[PDB]
């Protein structure tokens, strides 16, 4: 309503700009400094608002930072902060510097993730370890560990209690030869002195996320019991006892091959990421990146697979190349055959150089069946997304029969009446199902038998059914994404 404007048009734009067609929930722990209320879901706007709302260096803050770095736009983020246990212990690490710098040089470190790297120049020759260990003054504040800068040794104490702070491996410079002169006679030793003790086990998912639909759940923890509760909640969301709120969850498991294989509880509702014992990056950062990428930031098309070096590239993570593949090939096959997600370096490069990880197979943790038979109906992640899309799409289509007159006893419809019967109803549904081939379904083996419509008067006994209730029975198959062929080869020395 512009008084001095032109006559015919009045634009009147909206205040904000975004769609929030899909939502993502990130769950983790916070620190004392955080102002956000615990166990209450809140919306997250941008990185400028972080730190204060979720403490400095907290597990939740780091996970959120990577989520925003991947889904720059096109998805709405939510956070569910949690508090530490009653008697949680904090892990402690030690880094001792020994010797005296004999020449000018520089010292550089890599810990946890590339964002926390530091590079400071040693002042000059004849600087003892006390003047060294200035590394503390150079460590970034966001690092989840607190540096104390003791007399000749620097101690790193986790900012969050529990087992979460039990994953380190340091790559360092001052032990070999480097053009960026390593101050000769200086070395560093790495060791641990105290592990984490206790993790929280919230069990109130029915009260805080009571009846809200979330597309993707992300959990930044390694407690098996905590993950088990999340899976049970997802089951209830997919349950048949009430309207559904579909969703999916992402978790990670770390350890040796034997330990990892013991966590496969045939979870059709979770995608368990498997990592080795010597991963040079903090675990939850990688898991958060995978969840963020797999969120609507990429999966607005349910049938899209998040794999390969083009789609499943966790660009927001940088890690140096390791001396050994980590997951041996004989072990990679076993993990994939057992329903686990395995990641590896994107580009082969020189030993010690920087690279990025990518995902081999986008597969859930589904195995066997309710009747204990083995199948792969929900093996691939896209199957879950496609199934949810089919349910919503089918329900919308059937809405046109709401309040429509239905004739069941005498199937002839008078002239001028607006109605329908069973056969006409079934025919219309087949047209919809067939037309959707190539978008939500593959070619039906027998379309004449995979769709059935029956009135409630034919299922219940005499004088027990209700008027105007139907039963629809359907079977479908998602699009095929594979093929095998034999390549019999016959180099034949000529003979016509």
């Amino acid at each position: 309503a512009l008084s001095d404007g032109f006559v015919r048009l009045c634009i009147d734009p909206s205040l904000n700009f975004f769609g929030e067609g899909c939502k993502i929930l990130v769950e983790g722990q916070i620190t004392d400094d955080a102002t956000a209320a615990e166990n209450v879901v809140t919306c997250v706007n941008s990185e400028l608002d972080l730190v204060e709302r979720f403490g400095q260096g907290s597990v939740l803050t780091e996970s959120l930072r990577k989520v925003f770095c991947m889904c720059k736009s096109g998805v709405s983020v939510y956070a569910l902060p949690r508090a530490d246990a009653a008697a949680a212990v904090s892990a402690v690490y030690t880094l001792t510097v020994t010797g005296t710098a004999l020449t000018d040089g520089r010292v550089q470190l890599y810990m946890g993730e590339a964002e926390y790297s530091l590079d400071i120049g040693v002042d000059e020759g004849d600087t003892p370890t006390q003047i060294a260990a200035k590394i503390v003054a150079a460590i970034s504040p966001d690092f989840p560990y607190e540096a104390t800068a003791a007399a000749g040794v620097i101690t790193l104490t986790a900012r969050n209690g529990g087992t979460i702070g039990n994953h380190l491996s340091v790559i360092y410079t001052n032990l070999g030869s480097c053009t960026s002169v390593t101050p000769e006679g200086v070395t560093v030793a790495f060791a641990q002195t105290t592990p984490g003790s206790v993790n929280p086990e919230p069990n109130d998912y029915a009260s805080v996320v009571n009846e809200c639909c979330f597309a993707v759940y992300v959990l930044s923890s390694d407690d098996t019991d905590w993950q088990e509760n999340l899976r049970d909640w997802i089951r209830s969301a997919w349950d048949c006892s009430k309207p559904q709120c579909f969703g999916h969850g992402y978790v990670f498991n770390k350890g040796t091959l034997g330990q990892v294989l013991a966590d496969g509880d045939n979870s059709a509702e979770l995608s368990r990421l498997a990592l080795p014992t010597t991963y040079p990056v903090l675990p939850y950062l990688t898991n958060a990146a995978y969840g963020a990428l797999s969120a609507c930031s990429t999966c607005e098309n349910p049938e899209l697979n998040v794999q390969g070096q083009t789609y499943g590239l966790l660009s927001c993570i940088n890690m140096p190349e390791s001396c050994t593949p980590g997951w041996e090939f004989t072990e990679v096959t076993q993990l994939q055959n057992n329903g686990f997600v395995v990641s590896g370096p994107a580009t082969t490069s020189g030993q010690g150089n920087f690279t990025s990880p990518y995902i081999y197979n986008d597969v859930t943790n589904y195995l066997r069946d309710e009747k204990n038979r083995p199948n792969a109906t929900f093996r691939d992640a896209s199957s879950r997304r496609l199934a949810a899309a089919t349910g919503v799409a089918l329900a919308t289509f059937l809405q046109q029969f709401n309040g429509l007159a239905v004739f069941t006893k005498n199937t002839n419809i008078k002239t001028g009446i607006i109605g329908t019967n069973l056969r006409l109803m079934l025919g219309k549904i087949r047209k919809w199902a067939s037309d959707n081939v190539g978008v939500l379904f593959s070619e039906f083996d027998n379309i004449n038998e995979d769709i059935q419509l029956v009135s409630d008067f034919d299922v219940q006994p005499k004088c027990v059914g209700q008027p105007g209730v139907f039963h629809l029975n359907m079977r479908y198959r998602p699009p095929v994404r594979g093929a095998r062929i034999n390549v019999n080869l016959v180099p034949a020395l000529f003979d016509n």
Partner: protein, 398 residues
Amino acid sequence: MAGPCYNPNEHYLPASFKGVPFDADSSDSEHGRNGAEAEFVFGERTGYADLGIKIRSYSIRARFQTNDHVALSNAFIAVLESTGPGLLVHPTRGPVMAACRSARVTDSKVDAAGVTYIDIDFVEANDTVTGFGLVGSLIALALSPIITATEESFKRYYSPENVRYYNSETVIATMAEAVQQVQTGYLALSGNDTSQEKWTIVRDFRNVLIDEFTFFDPANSWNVLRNGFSYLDSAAVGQDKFTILRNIINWSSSHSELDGESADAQNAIFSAVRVLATAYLSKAYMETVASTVNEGLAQYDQIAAILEQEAQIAQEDCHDNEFFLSIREFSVSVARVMVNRAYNSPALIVYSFPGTMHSLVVAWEIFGDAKRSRELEGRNTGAPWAIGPKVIAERVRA
């Protein structure tokens, strides 16, 4: 079209020409591109070239049916025959300027009475200036204005025959040193030359310095200084002149310590030389390819600072107002070109690879020809087997 939900009035624009509406009945166009295909003798291969867009053409057919259609038809023709081109609202191609090239009007009194048809043949017509085009140049600097501006300033003050007599010797001695600096620079650049002109130039330099009265004339002094720089500039092309000119600028940063007008006669030599050296240094920077945007702009800042210093000196106390204006205008002209070279000469861009890679592989992935890897050596540090993970390369302009 598909579905019965078409509304032709909603997708076809209403025709018009020079503002007069009319009813359209057809719509055509003819686009294309000019080729120069060639086939060789006895060969099994053929070539091709590109020579620019081909001029378009449009054709429309109009129908009249209302009463007195002759008047509307006979009045619309008077618009087609008008002079010059005008806007045309093509039914499908939208507004576009054209110029009618012909029109056939068909009518009858017994076979078809009451309807008049007219076929038209338009042509695209873009306006053009009359002086067979007029365009600007943005590939070279203009040194004639600044050099002439410097000449006036130098002539205005440097006058050894009027300075107080017990300072003429010192002022002249300074001039001899200034020329000597150019002589040393030239001899360094053309060390390996053995032409017949090098001997002549060397003799000319020696003769002028040996003679004593040559510098008593402002006209003679200026001519030697200007010409001496001209030989220096043409001695070599490219990076060879960077060190030589920088040394001369260093020598011309001093200020006279005499008093009164005698100081002006000496500061004139210093100021004139530095401005001339800076101008020629800028020309030298324009004969080389910018290795990087950051490096290319760093070179420009080095020049703007020197020119800015001279402007302040020439405007300290309205010492030379006209010279101050000339310096200021030259600096903006230099910026217009130096900035363009840094940001647009090869049009560099930063890439984001997923890890370190060989130079050969990087070249193949980006451009599509491993033989172009030679260009990546100068822009990216790191060994040839560890380039990355961020690479500075040229824009692909397929």
